[PDB]
Amino acid sequence: EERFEITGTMRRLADQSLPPNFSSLENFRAYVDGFEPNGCIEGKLSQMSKEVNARIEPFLRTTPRPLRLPDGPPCSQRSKFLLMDALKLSIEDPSHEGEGIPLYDAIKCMKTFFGWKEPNIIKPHEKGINPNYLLTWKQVLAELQDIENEEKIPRTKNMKKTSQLKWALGENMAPEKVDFEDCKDVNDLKQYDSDEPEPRSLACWIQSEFNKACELTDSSWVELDEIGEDVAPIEHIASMRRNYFTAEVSHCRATEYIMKGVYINTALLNASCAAMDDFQLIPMISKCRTKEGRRKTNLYGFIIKGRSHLRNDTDVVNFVSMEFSLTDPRLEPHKWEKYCVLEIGDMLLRTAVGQVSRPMFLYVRTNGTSKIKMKWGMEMRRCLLQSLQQIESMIEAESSVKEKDLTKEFFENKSETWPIGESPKGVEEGSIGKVCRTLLAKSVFNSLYASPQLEGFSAESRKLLLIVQALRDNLEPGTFDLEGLYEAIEECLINDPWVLLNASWFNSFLTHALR
């Protein structure tokens, strides 16, 4: 005999947790126990206002307007490292294969360039001490030559804790925690003002950055391991899909960005936990096989790390990021809001049509990151899986209707048939290869420029897309609060250059989709 009891404190809560009018759980229990239906719904339906309805505004080819993108000063680059502007000092490292030492790989790269000028500031950081950014670069060059003074060569370098470094890395800029028992009354003490993030307008560069991400390079950026010999029918189809895709993505710039992501975030996390309270120099390295196929090491620049006594995954590491570039920062200054760019040397290119001297710049900026955001960058190879799954899922779907696998047709079709871009004429089509790289670039930028604004815009725009699809399917689509949906989409469009381009991309589609 199981016996469970509601009494004391619980019975008084039980009696108070009922509909109004009922003052007793036992009274109510009896109402329900002996309840029999008497068109209570059908009744209260007729009692209810007719203004309470779900009237269907029909979605016509005419009803949807272009999304309104915000006005304001042009949006700025907020990626950790340079993308299309990035420049690298390269060495061919053939005989030594496998994990080496990055510090020396950098010094070896540095020594391939003999064009260093007296560094001067070209475009300063409005909200920063610009002379400190110059001193830090001079300190790097300096401390790198000082290793060739040391009796025994070190594995890593720890920068001397100078003023300019202490400044840039934010040393002694963390305000003091004050027990409210002590600072009870303070007459200028206001809350952590979570300000309305001032709106920014969509600049051109974000599209340029992405266009360049979809391009091929003369360098295989990914070298994937072997796999079990194919047996089952699925395994033969699978390997076909993979290899076709792996082929077109192999040399794509997006995959360079993935590697830049992994190596840098990897090296930064290893340092953040190894040399916790040292200002470690962390070279920005990638590796690739050339188009002829020799193992080649690349140095993009340096990152100096701050104090990294990291307790939580959210806890912050401040760092300075000095990155080589050929691009003049005075052409699109609105981009380089957060950066102080120096001019640090001249490159010479003796090309088929004569001698071309170009100046070399150094995009230096203050910045920070956390174990979570570093891990994120370390796991950037998932962009490859995300990209392949989109390609794989489409083929699976487009094959369903015919009932036969389209994997071979898609990839072997040497006619450019996929609408993937726009020009002054209108929508220009491309190869399945262009689609693979385009979908990869998307997954990579989705990672690089990852924001809640994106999450939102992705989710809400999806609805409007699927509605438009129904209009093209002639399925008499209808909405309930279409103006409400737009407000929810547009609520996400503030200042993020990536989410703003995606919204421009939408408007661009929506015009061609209704014809």
Partner 1 sequence: MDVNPTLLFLKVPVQNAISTTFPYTGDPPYSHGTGTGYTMDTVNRTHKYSEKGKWTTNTETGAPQLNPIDGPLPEDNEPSGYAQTDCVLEAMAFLEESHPGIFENSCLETMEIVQQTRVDKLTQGRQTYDWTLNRNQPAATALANTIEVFRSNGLTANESGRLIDFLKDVMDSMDKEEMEITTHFKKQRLNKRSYLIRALTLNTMTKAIATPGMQIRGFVYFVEALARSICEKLEQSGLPVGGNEKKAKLANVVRKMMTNSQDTELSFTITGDNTKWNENQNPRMFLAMITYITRNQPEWFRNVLSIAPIMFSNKMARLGKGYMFESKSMKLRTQVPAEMLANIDLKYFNKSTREKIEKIRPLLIDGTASLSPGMMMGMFNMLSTVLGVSILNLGQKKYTKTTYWWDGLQSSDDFALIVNAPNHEGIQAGVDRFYRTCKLVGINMSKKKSYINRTGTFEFTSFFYRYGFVANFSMELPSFGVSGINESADMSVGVTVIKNNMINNDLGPATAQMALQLFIKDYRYTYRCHRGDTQIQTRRAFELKKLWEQTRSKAGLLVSDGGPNLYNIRNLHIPEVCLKWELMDEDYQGRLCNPMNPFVSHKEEYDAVATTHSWIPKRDEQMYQKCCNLFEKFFPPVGISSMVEAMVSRARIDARIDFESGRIKKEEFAEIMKICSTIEELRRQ
Partner 2 sequence: MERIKELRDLMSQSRTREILTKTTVDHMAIIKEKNPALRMKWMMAMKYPITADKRIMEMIPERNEQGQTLWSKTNDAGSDRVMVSPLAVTWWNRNGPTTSTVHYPKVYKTYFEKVERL
Instruction: Give the tokens for residue 363.
Output: 């995009």
- 229 CB neighbour count, 10 Å cutoff: 7
CA distances to 73, 109, 119, 121, 333 from 126, rounded to whole Å, are 15, 32, 19, 12, 11
Cα–Cα distance between 458 and 451 in angstroms, integer?
A: 11
Q: Scanning residues 454 to 473, which ones bind its own copies (CB under 8 A)?
A: none
Instruction: Give the tokens for residue 205.
Output: 């560069």
As measured in angstroms, the least distance from the Cβ of 111 to its own copies is: 8
Q: Scanning residues 102 to 131, which ones bind its own copies (CB under 8 A)?
A: 108, 111-112
As measured in angstroms, the least distance from the Cβ of 354 to partner 1 is: 30
Nearer to its own copies, 153 or 247 (CB): 153
Nearer to partner 2, 110 or 468 (CB): 110
As measured in angstroms, the least distance from the Cβ of 223 to partner 2 is: 19
Cα–Cα distance between 453 and 200 in angstroms, integer?
A: 13
Q: Give, in degrees to the nearest 5, the angle at Cα 451 between 487 and 432.
A: 95
Considering CB distances under 5 to 8 angstroms, the limit depending on partner class, which of partner 1, its own copies, partner 2, none binds residue 217?
Answer: none
152 binds its own copies (CB under 8 A): yes
251, 233 Cβ separation under 8 angstroms:
no
Q: Scanning residues 70 to 99, which ones bind its own copies (CB under 8 A)?
A: 95-96
* Three-class secondary structure of residue 237 per DSSP: helix
155 binds its own copies (CB under 8 A): yes
Considering CB distances under 5 to 8 angstroms, the limit depending on partner class, which of its own copies, partner 1, partner 2, none binds residue 152?
Answer: its own copies
Cα–Cα distance between 42 and 64 in angstroms, integer?
A: 37
295 binds its own copies (CB under 8 A): no
Cα–Cα distance between 429 and 445 in angstroms, integer?
A: 22
Cα–Cα distance between 490 and 456 in angstroms, integer?
A: 10
Q: Residue 117: which of 458, 360, 372 has the closest Cα? A: 360
Non-local (6+) Cβ contacts of 494 within 8 A are 70, 197, 199, 200, 453
As measured in angstroms, the least distance from the Cβ of 110 to its own copies is: 12
Which stretch, 36-44, 144-152, 289-297, 409-417, contacts its own copies (CB under 8 A)?
Answer: 144-152
Considering CB distances under 5 to 8 angstroms, the limit depending on partner class, which of partner 1, its own copies, partner 2, none binds residue 175?
Answer: partner 1
Residue 252 backbone dihedrals phi, psi, to 5 degrees:
-70, 135
Which stretch, 147-155, 228-236, 290-298, 311-319, contacts its own copies (CB under 8 A)?
Answer: 147-155
Considering CB distances under 5 to 8 angstroms, the limit depending on partner class, which of partner 1, its own copies, partner 2, none binds residue 150?
Answer: its own copies
Considering CB distances under 5 to 8 angstroms, the limit depending on partner class, which of its own copies, partner 2, partner 1, none binds residue 155?
Answer: its own copies
As measured in angstroms, the least distance from the Cβ of 15 to partner 2 is: 48
Cα–Cα distance between 380 and 422 in angstroms, integer?
A: 28
Which stretch, 145-153, 275-283, 352-360, 455-463, contacts its own copies (CB under 8 A)?
Answer: 145-153
Residue 462 backbone dihedrals phi, psi, to 5 degrees:
-45, -50
Considering CB distances under 5 to 8 angstroms, the limit depending on partner class, which of partner 1, partner 2, its own copies, none binds residue 356?
Answer: none
363, 341 Cβ separation under 8 angstroms:
yes
Nearer to partner 2, 44 or 309 (CB): 309
* Residues in contact with partner 2 by the rule CB under 8 A: 116-119, 138, 140-146, 149, 269-270, 273, 277-278, 309, 371, 375
